[PDB]
Amino acid sequence: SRVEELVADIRAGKMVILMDDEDRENEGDLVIAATHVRPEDINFMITHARGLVCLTLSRERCKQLNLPLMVDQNGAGTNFTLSIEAAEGITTGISAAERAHTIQAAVAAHAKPTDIVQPGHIFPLMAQPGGVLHRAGHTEAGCDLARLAGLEPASVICEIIKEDGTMARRADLEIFAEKHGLKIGTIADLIHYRMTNEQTVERLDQRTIQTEYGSFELYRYREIGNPDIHLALVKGEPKEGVTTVRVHGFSPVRDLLKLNKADGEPAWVLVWIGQDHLQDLGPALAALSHQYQTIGVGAQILRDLGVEKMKLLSSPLRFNALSGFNLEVVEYVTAD
Amino acid sequence: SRVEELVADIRAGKMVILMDDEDRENEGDLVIAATHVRPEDINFMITHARGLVCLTLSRERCKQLNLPLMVDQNGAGTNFTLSIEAAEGITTGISAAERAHTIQAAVAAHAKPTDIVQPGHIFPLMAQPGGVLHRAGHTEAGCDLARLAGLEPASVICEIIKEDGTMARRADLEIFAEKHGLKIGTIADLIHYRMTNEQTVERLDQRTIQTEYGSFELYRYREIGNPDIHLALVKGEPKEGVTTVRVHGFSPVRDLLKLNKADGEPAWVLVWIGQDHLQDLGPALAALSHQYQTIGVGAQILRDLGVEKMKLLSSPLRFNALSGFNLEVVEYVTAD
Ligand SMILES: [Cl-]
Ligand SMILES: [Cl-]
């Protein structure tokens, strides 16, 4: 149940079960280091999980493999399956050993494109560059887990479907985990781990800007994996004591109501998360991964700025959400 | 120089020169209705324009042809080339007649995919659904122009390259137009025509909203081709006299400085253009087609709301910017 054990089992060559957010796909995947995969591992997967056995790859390894996305644009789920994979010690490629062998060719250290062919019976998945920092899928989660084991960022994953024929949910996954001696994890638990044990954000440049509220200092930040720009509007020296803080994600209702505006003034640090696009005003008007993503970026920004005790302009968070950072940074959470 | 003649020459089967915005591509294309294209028309193109001869198609026509975009994602210029086109009365397909013959097969009324093959030597281009309403390219312009002549929304277009070997600009295109007896046109001038002689925008539903400025009526609008859902916040009954108006496109001056809010308050109609995405605050921080797009959508909204005389909260517009909507609507542009 603990991220550090999950990494240790993956290094050890064992499997691990990984759950995503219950308001995402809400599924459990067996997860093993693709480098340590063995025939009997594929056989366990197709037998007691009976989902699609898939092979999570990095974008680098896909380029090294000359292996693109099989579909690019779809319509008006989100999942990057690839052209199917086969090796060339293969007859049909659907046997457990041969499938294992197909994985071996793909994730070999110095693999070439001619070590592999398409189509096949192994189904590679291309993680996004920054991994579970941005997309909280099993694809990114299998890779980033294997990376933490010091292995090739490659994992083999298979959905766990109940004997009933429906998708095993947390209840059924916990039983299955203990029935077979496997530990379990939340990729959201992996987000917060990565945010706690890694320098994920780097500062870019400082500026001074003149606003109707006053003068602010702009710290422009960038996070590994993604070209987005996170901001911090600072007044004063947040190392000067308690700092009045808002971590801030856009929500197209400023144009009508007023929260960010009513937040610019009680600055008399404001964080801002970059996203590749900001929703337009019209459309329609948990996500624990998106929460730990947000406040993890917001937390590394405030730590880099020297924040040590905060006056939050947010409604209360998840309870221990801010654990892993400077101290218990919150003494007073705001009203309206 | 005048849109209605440009439509009339296309109906007659002659060519017309179309320029895009001086800051987009800044090129002139010969443009002829693909349905009226003849061997000697292709030959004039490859001789005295010497760009790529291309065949603008609608998405309907492309689907009927089973004919996709040849690249889907590349790198995030913007141009929708297709898999190359060839017919089957062709030997090589590069002759003036054979290219002309290839076009005919594509734009024949009830053409099939088996009327046509790939690759070839004609280069079809897929316009976006709403045409020149959204993308102000020669591709959309060739189709919409041919449509206005009541013909198949299909045109053949070719870049006009100087004898010098560089791209003919307005000066050189104007000379070329008169040397060969052709009329010349601006895609922006076609934008404004469509906005003046077509009902392009339709409302969806009315609502009431409660805001910190007060209560508004929400009019949701959609425009042909739908990259958008447009809004109009109304206070009062604009049909009872003068209306204080702002047409509003998003920009950095909402979160940091204060214009939109300082527009919410003087509403004691605010229009809002739908955008496929709203730029984030970090990134980096004429387009005359995009202007006539803006105020044409904003103008059909304000007429639909019954606006006839305005007090604009904008800085002054282009001269004759409005020109077609609900007589001379502006007496008072309001200050900073
Ligand atoms: Cl195979
Ligand atoms: Cl050809």
Structure characterization notes:
Two copies of one chain form a homodimer. Chain A is of the alpha/beta class. Chain A has two domains: 1-200, no CATH class; 201-336, no CATH class. Chain A is built from nine helices and 14 strands. In chain A, the strands form three sheets. In chain A, strands 4-5-3-6-2-1-7 form a seven-stranded mixed β-sheet, with helices on both faces. The first copy, chain A, has a four-stranded antiparallel β-sheet with strand order 8-9-10-12. The two termini of chain A are 37 Å apart. In chain A, 43% of the residues are buried. Chain A binds chain B through residues 72-73, 209, 211-212, 220, 228-231, 250, 252, 254-258, 260-261, 264, 272, 274-283, and chain B through 72-73, 209, 211-212, 216, 220, 228-231, 233, 254-258, 260-261, 264, 272, 274-283. One chloride ion binds at residues 86, 90, 93, 120-121 of chain B.
